[PDB]
Amino acid sequence: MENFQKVEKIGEGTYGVVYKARNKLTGEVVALKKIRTEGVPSTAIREISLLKELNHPNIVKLLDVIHTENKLYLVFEFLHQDLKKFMDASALTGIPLPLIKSYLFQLLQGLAFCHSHRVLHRDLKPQNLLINTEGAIKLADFGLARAFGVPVRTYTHEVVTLWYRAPEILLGCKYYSTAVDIWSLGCIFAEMVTRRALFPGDSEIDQLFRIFRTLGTPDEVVWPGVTSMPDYKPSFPKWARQDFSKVVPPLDEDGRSLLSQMLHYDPNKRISAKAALAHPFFQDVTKPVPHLRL
């Protein structure tokens, strides 16, 4: 506000609205998130500070945080396109495997970094993965479910995407672990490969059941303790696990192996970002430049 000239509304994110803006003084171009109010947390405003010092090449830089006039502004380094747009633009031919692999690899580095600093993203999706002309991809819009929790929607009547939500969140787990980010990234990896959302649920239960229909209804054997989770119902339909080869054709076996590990039901068996970086799938990783139309 006042020190910035809104150039264009980029989107209506989760907590607020996001604008492309220019610092009327420095002339620097940035992404400005405006947050939705008579209290304002402290554990939050300090969860923010931790994010400011959280600097990594695969994490969008948080430049400034401005709390004024019952509004909270987060100033981020600006990137030119999100992965959702890039995937749509590449739908006819598909993103070449080397670029998919590079993006996945960089995103795992970003996650390995935040997770080692005990920071969870919580809401990874194509729209919050930003890319630039140099072939980089960065994590954006980290969620503070440990600050603003997660109400009925985003901030003003808008359908929240559940497509990338880990099963343990859907089943009512109160405490998320870093594993929820691995699950979301696995769903994104699959989507880049097939050019179709892996689990496109339109409600929590439909989301949950689409996961069950593909990976099999979980039980105590593959997920110890699953039947005692908050929203688990013995009445859940029992679907058999589908052949994984039908899930992401024509991804090679290394890629399928890695994906299967990112999609393990048990949060404790799900591969970590660090371990995923060492998977054979990345033996030939490179950093190609994407063809971006801006």
Ligand SMILES: Nc1cccc(C(=O)c2sc(Nc3ccc(S(N)(=O)=O)cc3)nc2N)c1
């Ligand atoms: N989703 C989300 C929510 C809150 C903040 C941010 C964010 O920090 C952004 S958003 C952006 N630019 C951009 C994004 C999308 C497009 S698009 N649809 O491809 O044309 C173009 C530029 N840059 C940064 N840093 C991102």
